[PDB]
Structures are given as structure tokens and as C-alpha cells.
Nucleic acid binder design. Structure first.
Lengths: 15, 73, 302, 88, 74, 90, 75, 71, 76, 69
DNA sequence: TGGAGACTAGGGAGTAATCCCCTTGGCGGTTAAAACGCGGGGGACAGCGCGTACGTGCGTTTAAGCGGTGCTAGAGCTGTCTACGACCAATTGAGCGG
DNA sequence: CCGCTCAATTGGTCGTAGACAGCTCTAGCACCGCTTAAACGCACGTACGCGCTGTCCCCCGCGTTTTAACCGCCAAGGGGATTACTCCCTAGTCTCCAG
């Protein structure tokens, strides 16, 4: 399992 | 009501189906299967009509319901 | 955030099709609704999963399972083109059968007041029925392909496989981007904001966010490189929502543009649905491989 | 009786009477929801398909009866033929 | 030319649903003609059944009996 | 591959292939051609169009059988003539 | 005018009758009726399969042609 | 049995049918197809004969069966 | 578990496929799935014919029951 | 086709719920089995020619079951 | 490369199919009528389709293009319609017996 | 028509020999149906005034078919005797699955 805590830039938002 | 399906109606229908002698309570029983078949074909026909956004059922929706049943005729 | 993989098959290795969390419950103990390919709806208690009730009313496989906001009326959508309204180790009794779909039902939406039901099926039409009368009251058949997503806000949003998004005033109001039927998922359930201001549309790969002012052009789109998003779920100011990809689960926030958390490489098949609980502290996540897993998190931002 | 099977098997006309089958269809639509227009063409189609269903089911239940070394046909054959076809 | 209103890709898709792979470019007029012939052959029976019922319009049921005479009830 | 794709699309599907009002107008032409002042109910037009659809699909499958027996993949109106004659139509 | 010879078909129809039901009755008129019917049907089948063959740039007729003709006839 | 409709009989029937050239496997698939054409027509004829209570099979039954078949 | 042994099933599907066309190999998954479906069809028809036999108030199956079941199902 | 052995059929029947079994049923269901594979494989090869391959798949048998029911 | 579950052959008999014999019910004419079914005439209120204006866009249409294909010429093997001598079932000529 | 013989000869058929007409295979050629690009254009939906085509239920006209009580009689059925056929090992074997 892979889990990232409640802090991804590779999954940024592109407007 | 369902008694509209007359005793001689079942008589002659089964006779065309090819029965030499008919039992006595099969008349009262087959109105049940008539009920079941109606409450399926008409049930799906009215939904087909509503899907067509019309309030008048037509023979085409009916034969489509038969197609879904698989007894097209 | 803790991720626990359940090693037990929920329905004797049947594929995963739908989930529904009891919104009516306001405590820590959560109730799970599980209807899948087993042609039966199994009710389980999650706090650890314990099976509570099993209902085999559906004649065929059930694709969508959902409950009313009050949590007392459960609508189960199956491949028999019938939606059964369920009422109150547990006993479940069907109250109404919300028929009216010509094909298998894919997505089911409820109403906040609970007096209306919104259904989506493969018949390329939208079925709206009144819970009080139990009969269809409005039909939106503008879909030219399979309809796999519908939600209720003033407006009703409908998404189909024809790569077109339809918004209808409770006639169609706006038409809006998507891909073809190459997606291996059977659910494209769009999600509206809890306040209804924003609408989320997956399977666009990117997921677009539209606002109440203008839904024709989305200001921002959250990319989904690799796997495509299938379902969107929002926890029931700032709000936290979740979008499920084919094999990845990401949780986004109202403020942070980037995903708050990312979970992937958990199941070996395509994901089926995304759904949170009433309290938001229980969210079991799985795919269509025939198994289940659980994701738990605290720090509830009350 | 065999003369009578001949006179209807040769024929094609309806066997259920028009008006009470029409009334049965109307009341069946009533209990679903009111305010429905049934174009007489659709009622004719219902009568045709319903008579076809019953003649087919009666042929199959005759097969079942003659299987049981009985010329008469009883309800038992009726439900068994319904089930074997997969209806129930 | 409204008989040619049945478009070339329309005939192509029709034949394909029957399971074809390659279609000759000169078959299109031929299938238009055979379609017109069949349509006449069934509309005639529909018309006679409407007239015998003393009907001034044709409904969906009549063409069903027309096909019943033809031998392709559907 | 395009053919195989659209076969997978279509043989499961059952929607229309000839468009609605082109067929409806063709029905109008033939109706007024043989005897004028007839009214066609749109449900009847849909019915007749479905019958035409099925007849053409069946005939095209039979001429495909003929072509396969003839060892060629492309159809030929000679195949149409053979199918019509073997069926006893014309 | 008949081409299939009489008593072979007489015995053939009698034997299929017996394989169906024993002690069956067949008049001569019925056997000639069956004879003309089967002759017409088989002559038509051969004629049409000959068309099927001559389509295929082929003079002889082999079994693919006959099964094609039957399958097209839909029986 | 089935072999009674012999090779030269089918040969001359084909000659009357107009086909110039003939193969071998035809000589037995024709027997098979003829037995197929025969079993159903005899079946239906027996139905109408029992249906009219006739042990003997009249020619009217034969033409009725042929009309049902379409020949 | 299944109640029909394999390589008779693979050899029979091989031979029939051969009589239709040459060189059509299969992989184990397809033959296993088709064997599963075939066994399901046989067991369903067998239960059906069992019910038909008990209809004639004789517990023993007979082969006329088989084609009766097939023809009521409209198989042939 | 004889490869379908007698007691394989017999415990198929025992699963079917029967008590007393006849003899002719063995080759009777052998024949019906033959017909079942013929039409199933008929549909399978119809989809294989549509697929332009030589090896059948699980999708082919799935479609065979869908078309038979 | 080997041997344990299992298919085949068969004795054993014991249960189950099959056939006949009342036997009692209950289903098929049928008669008198009646009564609900078939027909046929209205009113226009209220429903459906026909036709039209406009959109808009998803479809058709043209084409340039090239490559899968139809076929056409050329063998290579092959089974089959020539002739014939053999069987060989067998139609006609007659019946008894019904 | 059966159903079966008792013969005559008598056309009708069966297997043989094979030459070659033709099925089948190979191959090249040209050619002519598949393919985006772009134009267009008419499907196609949406509304909407206008019209007429299901239609209505009432009566009544009648009248044919349906109800039903009666009655003879045909089979549904329950039982018992009789003959056939899978169980239950016993053993060979075989062979399919395993190491």
C-alpha cells in the first residue's frame, strides 16, 4: 500500500 | 374483470392448441397466467411509451415489449 | 490516513459494483450497503466489517446502491431495470419498486428533501419519480448514448457516454470534453458540492470543476495521468472531496489545488465507485477485483 | 372434438372476445396508473400476442400431458410447462 | 431521386450489420431497386388490409399482417 | 480493424441504419405513386422501416454466404441476383 | 412424367413410416403425390444449386454449393 | 433403406434438373436432405391424419402438408 | 470443482473444430470456461428432466424426457 | 464423443438431484451435448471470423452464452 | 518417468417401470335464454400528427490515393461419365384371404 | 391396398478403366473500394398554429354466444403382479495427472 498523509506537485492543477 | 376471458374462450383457444379434453379448474387457473403475461407485456409497453415521451401506447411499443420477452408475433 | 486491505470476499468473489453509506446515522458505528454481481444486496456494519442483512430481491446484478438523506429509504438499482425502495442480523423490507427504466440502471441519485428520486440507466434516458406517489413524474431522454451519471442539486445534472454533459432545470438548460467508450469502468457518477455551488465531472485525463455561475467552461481541471477518474465523492468554509481513478484514489480540498492525499497500487482491477460516510471517518476503498480494503483517517476538520 | 380442432386450426380469427379482452387490458392499465389512451391497434396486438402465448403454452402442456399418458390436461402440467420454459 | 435518399453510407452500414467486409461501388443502385421492390410488395398488402377494414389511414398493426402474408412476421 | 470495430459496435446494437424521414419520404412517394390521398401513421412508418431493416440485413447475410462460397470477400450484384433467385423472390 | 423409380420410393416411405410408427397405411395415390412433390422440390434444389455453381466459375456441383443453397433457403 | 434412391436415379434427376456435371458426395447428401424433407412432411401428414382420425393418408393431406411447406 | 475430466473435453473440441476448419488452437482459460458453461447447461437440463420425470410419477429418467425438455425449451 | 464417460454423466445427474437413472439417457445426452457444442462453436467461429484470428477466447464463449442465454 | 483414482466387465437383486381392473368422479354435449357482445350514430372537448421556421452539427459528399482484392492465364492432380459385363431387384401375370 | 408368394425377362443398377474437363492452387496485374479534408446540407430537434383523425358512450337492435343444470360415460387413478435394469463390490486396466 502507498499512502500520503494530509499535507503531489506532479499531480498539480493546470488552469 | 379478469372474468372477461370466458370459459368457452379458453375452451376454443386450447382446442386450437390441440387438446382433446380440458380439466375443470384449468379455466380458473389459466386466467392467472393470462394475468401474469399481461402484467409483464403491458407493463414494459407503457414504459416504452413513456420513454418515447408520448401518452398514447402504440402497437410498435407493444411488439418491442414482445421482442424483449422474445415472443414476437 | 491508514489503509487496511480486507482479505475476505464480500459476495463470494463477485465483482464490486456499488457502495452506499448510511447518511442518517449520526454516530461512530457506520452501516454499509453492498450490492454487486451476486444478485443480492448485503448490509454490513463497519466500525472491522460485520455482515448484518442480506436481501436477494434483485433478480439480476445490482449496479447502483444508494440511500435517502434521512437514511431510512434505500434505493437499489439492478440489471432488472427496477429500483427497489428498502425500508426498516437485520431485517430489510422493500417498500416500493421505482420502475420506469428500459435498460439496466447505472447511476442513482436522491433528493435532499427525500420526496424525489433521480435515476440513470443504460436506456439513454433520465427517470425522475416522486417518492410520495412512487411513480415517474419527469423524463429527460436527451442522451444519445448510455447514461452513466446523474445528480440532483434548482437544476439536475446528467452525464452520458456520448461525451456530453447535460444540465436540466427541475427541460435541458445547458450542454457542455470527454472520451469514448474505451473506459473499462461502468460508473461515471458526477458529484455536486454539498452546498451545490460547484459540480465535479470525471472522465474528461482530467477532472473538470464548474461553478454555479457558469457551468459551460470549467475554470480548473484536475489531471489524472495514466488511469482515468471514474467516481467522485465529497465528504458530508472548506470542504473535502475524493475522486477515484481506475486504480488510484485521491482526496482533494476546497483550498488546495493539488491533491491533499494520494492512494494507489492497492487493488489489481479497475475501481468501481467512491463514497464517504455521514461522519466522514470511515471510507473503505476497493476496486472490481472481488475484494475490499479500508482507508481510515482522523483529524476530522470539524 | 377433432372436427372442432380442425375448424379452428384451419382458421386464424380471434378466439378471445373483443370487448372483454379490451376491458381487461383497460383495467390492467388502470391499476398501474390512470389516464392512458389505448389505440385499438395496440389492443389488437395485445390480443394477437396473448392468444399466441396461450396456444403455444397449451401445445407445450399438451406435450406434457401426453407424456404422462393422460389425454386430459391439468393445472400441474400448466405450472410445470410455465417453469420449464423458464417463466417461473 | 428521393429513392437515392437512402445514402451510400446508410446502405454500407446496413450491409455491414449483416456481416460484410467489402462492398462493390456499383451495388448501390441495385440495392436501392430491390428495396423499392420489397417496399412496394409489402405496402400493397398493407393497403389492402387497410381498405378491407374500411380504414382511411394505415397503422403499425397493418404492416405486421402484411409481413405475415409475406412470411417475415416481426 | 475498422470493420471489426464497427461489427462489434453494431451486431450487439439494434438502432436504425437508414435515417427516419428519408425513409418516411420514400414511403410518401410510393404511397402517392400507387394511389394518392393516403396517410401514414409515424408508428406504422417506424414499423415498416424496422421490417425493411431486417429484410435487408437478412438478404445481405445471405449474399455474404454466397460470396464466401464463391471465394471472394468483396460482394457483387451477381451475388444479389443469386440470393434473390435462390430465395425465390426474383 | 416421373423420374424417380416407383417401388424404391414406395419402400422408402413405408420404411420411414415404420421407423415412425408400425403398421402404417399408404395408398398408391398418396405415394404418387409424394413422388411428384419430392421430384419438384429436388429438381428445384438442383437447378438452384447449379446456378450457385455457375456463379462460382464452376460447372460441377460439390457439397458446399448444396449446403449454401439450403442455408440460404433457411430450412 | 436410404440407399434405395440409387445413384443413377439421382443422376437422371440431375440431368432433368439441367446441371451438366456432378460430384460424388452429392449422391449421399442428397439422400440425407431428402430424408430430412421427408421426415417433417410425414410427421405433419401423420398429425393431420390423427387429427381427422384417419389411419389411411389421403392425397388431400399431402397437398395440405405441401402448402404448409410452401411447395 | 468440476465433474468432467479434461483432455477428453479438449480432444473432442479439437476434433470438432478440425471438422469445421483446420488449425484453431485454444488456450486453457477458454476451454475451462466453456467446460464450466457446458456442465452448467447439462446439470440444468438434467434437473429439468428430473422434474419432468417426477411429473409422470416415476422417479426414473427416460430419454423421451430429454427431448421433451429440449422442445418445451424450444431448443429444436 | 464417447470420451464423455458414463459416471461423469452419472454424478452430473446426482448433482441434478436424481435417484434412479436409465440407460439410453447416456448417449441421448451425448447427442444433445453434440448439438450444444455445435451451436455454441457455431456462434464462436462466427465471432472468430469477425475477429480475424485463429484462437478462440473467453469473450467468444461469453458471447456464445449471451446469444444462447 | 510412474502409480492411484477411476472406467470398464460382470455377478446380484431389489427396487421400479409397465400393464390390467375396477371405480368413482367429473368433464363433455345440450337445451332455454339472456345478456353481454357486435354494430353504428352522433359532439366536440380534448390529442395526435403535418407542415413550417430555424438551428447546428452530425452526418453525407469528393477526392486523391494506394493497396487488398477479382480475376484472369497457367498448370497439376483428380474423380467422374463415358462402355460394359456382371448382378439384380423386380413388374407384370396370376392368385388365396381380407 | 395390403401381404405374400412363384416365375419371366428385363430394364435398371454396380463396380470397373481411365482421359481429361475441370477443381484447386499460384501469381501478377490493375483497379477500384477504403481514407482524412473539407464543403455542405439536409437530418433532426423544437415549437406551434391548424386541422382531422381515434373517438365516445348511449341506445338500441338484435342476436349469437355464453350460463348452467342434466346426464351418460370416458378416463385418472390407485393397486397389484411381472419383468427388466442399476446398484456394490471385485478386479483389470488405463491413463491422466503428477513429480
Amino acid at each position: 500500500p502507498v499512502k500520503i498523509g494530509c499535507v503531489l506537485q506532479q499531480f498539480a492543477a493546470c488552469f | 374483470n379478469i372474468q372477461g376471458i370466458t370459459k368457452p374462450a379458453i375452451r376454443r383457444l386450447a382446442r386450437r392448441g390441440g387438446v382433446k379434453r380440458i380439466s375443470g379448474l384449468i379455466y380458473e387457473e389459466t386466467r392467472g397466467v393470462l394475468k401474469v403475461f399481461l402484467e409483464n407485456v403491458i407493463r414494459d409497453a407503457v414504459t416504452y411509451t413513456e420513454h418515447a415521451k408520448r401518452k398514447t401506447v402504440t402497437a410498435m411499443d407493444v411488439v418491442y415489449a414482445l421482442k424483449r420477452q422474445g415472443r414476437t408475433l | 490516513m491508514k489503509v487496511i486491505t480486507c482479505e475476505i470476499a464480500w459476495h463470494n468473489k463477485e465483482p464490486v459494483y456499488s457502495l452506499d453509506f448510511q447518511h442518517g446515522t449520526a454516530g461512530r458505528i457506520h452501516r454499509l450497503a453492498s450490492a454487486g454481481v451476486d444478485t443480492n444486496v448485503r448490509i454490513w456494519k463497519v466500525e472491522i466489517v460485520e455482515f448484518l442483512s442480506n436481501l436477494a430481491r434483485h433478480t439480476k446484478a445490482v449496479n447502483v446502491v444508494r440511500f435517502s438523506p434521512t437514511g431510512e429509504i434505500l434505493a437499489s438499482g439492478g440489471d432488472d431495470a427496477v429500483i427497489l425502495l428498502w425500508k426498516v442480523k437485520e431485517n430489510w423490507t422493500v417498500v416500493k419498486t421505482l420502475r420506469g427504466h428500459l435498460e439496466d440502471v447505472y447511476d442513482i441519485c436522491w433528493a435532499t428533501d427525500g420526496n424525489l428520486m433521480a435515476s440513470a440507466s443504460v436506456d439513454n434516458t433520465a427517470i425522475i419519480w416522486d417518492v410520495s406517489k412512487g411513480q415517474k413524474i419527469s423524463i429527460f431522454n436527451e442522451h444519445k448514448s448510455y447514461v452513466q451519471g446523474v445528480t440532483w442539486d434548482q437544476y439536475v445534472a446528467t452525464l452520458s457516454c456520448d461525451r456530453v454533459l447535460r444540465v436540466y432545470s427541475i427541460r435541458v438548460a445547458f450542454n457542455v470534453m470527454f472520451h469514448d467508450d474505451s473506459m473499462k469502468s461502468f460508473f461515471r457518477r458526477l458529484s455536486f458540492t454539498p452546498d451545490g455551488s460547484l459540480l465535479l465531472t470525471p472522465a474528461g485525463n482530467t477532472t473538470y470543476v464548474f461553478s454555479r455561475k457558469n457551468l459551460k467552461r470549467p475554470i480548473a481541471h484536475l489531471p489524472c495521468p495514466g488511469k482515468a477518474t471514474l467516481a467522485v465523492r465529497c465528504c458530508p468554509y472548506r470542504l473535502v472531496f475524493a475522486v477515484a481513478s481506475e486504480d488510484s484514489v485521491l482526496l482533494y480540498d476546497t483550498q488546495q489545488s493539488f491533491p491533499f492525499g494520494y492512494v494507489s497500487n492497492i487493488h489489481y482491477h479497475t475501481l468501481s465507485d467512491i463514497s464517504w460516510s455521514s461522519d466522514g471517518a470511515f471510507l473503505a476503498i476497493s476496486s472490481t477485483d472481488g475484494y475490499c480494503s479500508f482507508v481510515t483517517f482522523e483529524k476530522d476538520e470539524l | 372434438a377433432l372436427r372442432e380442432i380442425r375448424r379452428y386450426q384451419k382458421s386464424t380469427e380471434l378466439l378471445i372476445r373483443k370487448l372483454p379482452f379490451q376491458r381487461l387490458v383497460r383495467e390492467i392499465a388502470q391499476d398501474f396508473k390512470t389516464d392512458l389512451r389505448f389505440q385499438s391497434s395496440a389492443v389488437m396486438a395485445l390480443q394477437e400476442a396473448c392468444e399466441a402465448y396461450l396456444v403455444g403454452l397449451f401445445e407445450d402442456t399438451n406435450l406434457c400431458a401426453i407424456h404422462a399418458k393422460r389425454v386430459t390436461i391439468m393445472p400441474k402440467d400448466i405450472q410445470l410447462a410455465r417453469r420449464i420454459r423458464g417463466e417461473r
